[PDB]
Every structure is written in structure tokens, then in C-alpha cells.
Symmetry: C3
Subunit: 114 residues, 3 copies
Amino acid sequence: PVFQLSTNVSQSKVTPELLKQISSLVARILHKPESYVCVHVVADQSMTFAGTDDPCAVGSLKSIGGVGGSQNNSHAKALFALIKDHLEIEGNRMYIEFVDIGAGDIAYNGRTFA
Amino acid sequence: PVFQLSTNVSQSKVTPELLKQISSLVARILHKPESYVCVHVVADQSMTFAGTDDPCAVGSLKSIGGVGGSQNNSHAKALFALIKDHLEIEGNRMYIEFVDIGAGDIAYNGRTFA
Amino acid sequence: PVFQLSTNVSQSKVTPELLKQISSLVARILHKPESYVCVHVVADQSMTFAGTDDPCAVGSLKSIGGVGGSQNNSHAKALFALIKDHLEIEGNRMYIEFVDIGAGDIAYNGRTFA
């Protein structure tokens, strides 16, 4: 399970503790061990949303399962909640994409999972 | 609708006006309100194309619909045209990926669209 | 064929020769001309794996075909091998995603391939 986020806010707000809290939350919402969670947050990007350069973000959560349907709604609410409290990005200027990956299409330690 | 572009050219060329013109163009070619368009351009990356570090770019346009078939051809011509005039990237060293997203697989303001 | 890699290791290790060796290897493992290969490596990112900020990486290989099934296993072994020798990332802290792209969904030089 991989969570990636791009934002135009300052790298000052992207603390190593934020990455930890994201990691923990992703493990919880996907019901997978945190030992497999990878988090990547990218700051101070050149980004617009709705034509303006005000604070915004685009992210994605990629997983083998756990990313289909109304579960994505509940999971979104939590991720949006965490990202705003820490990065102060309004919900109406952020997207998070949910991407289901096949076991044969992701390699860990040199081999696919299936 | 999200447009993302990575390039090895200097951040000097990535002006806030470029991002605006991209935003406008993406809204037009997808026939969606610009209020939902997010643009992300990343510059001065470590990239090769055809084995060389000359100017190049890889991008993607992700959307709920509007990204299938020969429409992608017309849309490509316009995006390639804009990116070259501003970033001076030859067409034969750029890729743009078109990615259809399901409504249940992208969250905005804390909830999916379906 | 596009190979992208994000890592928290220093940009010092991402030499222009590394990008060349990656390019060469991607051409070989996908059996496609290196003239179409694009490589993008991003360094010194804010990333955690398993909750820690030790060296880690996430990448993806996107291609029209050549990315399905047990072939992904053999290809992974080679990519993991190259990335570690040069970037010193342990296999158990790296993911590589394999993504099949439709010919109508990627544009080169202003037009899709189909």
C-alpha cells in the first residue's frame, strides 16, 4: 500500500511526524500491516487548482484491494481530515485517487506477490 | 481532471502563467469546469529520453471520461503545442498518458463522486 | 515505455550514468527500442517505509504490453538488483508497480499510437 501526495504548501509543514501519522492511518484504513506501508509527500510544487495557486493537493492511495466503492468515502474523510489539520489544505482544493493494483503487477523485494 | 507533467527543463520556464494556460486548455479539451481542474508541473528533474539528458517530458491527464479514443489524438496535439512553445520540448521526446478514472475512485472534499 | 522512481536517498547517488544504465536495462527487459525509453528518477524525497525514514523507494514501469504476469518477476529481480547496487536501497523497502497502457491512451509527438 502506497500513499503519495503532491502539494504547493511549504516543506516546512511536512514534518517526519506527519509522514508517520499518515503511515499509521493508511495501515488502519486499509487493514494491512504498517510494515508494508510506503508514504511519499512532496511539497512546494508548482500547482494550480481552479486556476489559482492557493494551497492545493493531489494524492493517490494504491493497494491490492481495500480501495473499491463506498469504503473509499470513509477513507477519504479521514485522509482529508488529517491533511488539512497539518497542511491547512481546504477539502475543495484537494483530490485523492484510489487505485486497485493486481498482485502480479507490484514487486516487493525483487518478486511480485502473485 | 488532473494534468501532471515532469520535465528536465529549468523551473525558470514554468511560470505561474504557464500553469494558468494549461489549466484553461485542460478545461476546454475535457469540456469540464475549470473550477475542478488541477495542474502540477515539475521542473529540473533527472530524466533521460532515448538514452540522453536533452529536454524531455512525461505527463498524464486523468479524468472521469473524456480520455478515450481518437479524442485523445486531438487533445494531444493541443497539449504538445502548448508545451513546446513554452518549454521548448520537441514532440519526439515527450509522452502524455491519458487515464480514465472511475467516479468511485476519486475523492474531492472528503467524498467520492459516486 | 516509462520508468519512474522516487527515493529518499541523496541526489548525489543519482548520476546521469545511473539514468543511462536504467534506460538500457528497461529497453532490454521490455524488448523495445531504447529510442522510446524515458527514465525519471527523483531523489531526496520525504518518504517513509514501514513507519521509518530509512532509505526506500517506490517506482513504476509503464508500457504497452511486456508488463503482465511472471515476466514481471524476472524484470523485478533485475531492476531491484540495479537499484540497490547504485542507491543502496534494500529490497524489503522498495515497491515497483507494473502498469499496462493501451495504445490509444498514450501520445507521442502529438498523436496516440492507436
